[PDB]
Design a protein around this ligand. Structure first.
Ligand SMILES: [Mg+2]
Ligand SMILES: [Mg+2]
Ligand SMILES: [Mg+2]
Ligand SMILES: [Mg+2]
Ligand SMILES: [Mg+2]
Ligand SMILES: [Mg+2]
Length: 51
RNA sequence: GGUUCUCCCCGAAAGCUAUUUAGGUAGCGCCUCGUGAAUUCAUCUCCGGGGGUAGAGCACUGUUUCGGCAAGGGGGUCAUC
């Protein structure tokens, strides 16, 4: 139970650190986000087909 | 901007790379927990190594002063077929 006092060890930040995306309500990047670059599953080419 | 009870153990980073990126983020580095593994790792002594820095030097690349020797160049006087 985060954010329930000093003694709990997870107070005043809820384990989210300081003012990042993870600290915002509903914040955080989508799956595969590489900081702005096209992710590895897009740098590499498609191959094959499903039989 | 704010995030509410307690105790115990360990304990960071503000770096690299990349980004319509530079008060954001991802991977790695660093932290924690768990599971494995070797006289694995660290320090010292001895031994075996590649350096080319500090310093020094002026053969080389350049730079710099003085002296000697001295072509050559410039100026003047004659002559300038
Ligand atoms: Mg804490
Ligand atoms: Mg805050
Ligand atoms: Mg954060
Ligand atoms: Mg401690
Ligand atoms: Mg910003
Ligand atoms: Mg030196």
């Amino acid at each position: 139970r985060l954010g329930r006092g000093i003694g709990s060890g997870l107070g005043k930040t809820g384990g989210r650190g300081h003012k990042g995306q993870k600290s915002r309500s509903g914040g955080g990047v989508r799956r595969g986000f590489e900081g702005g670059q096209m992710p590895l599953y897009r740098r590499l080419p498609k191959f094959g087909f499903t039989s």
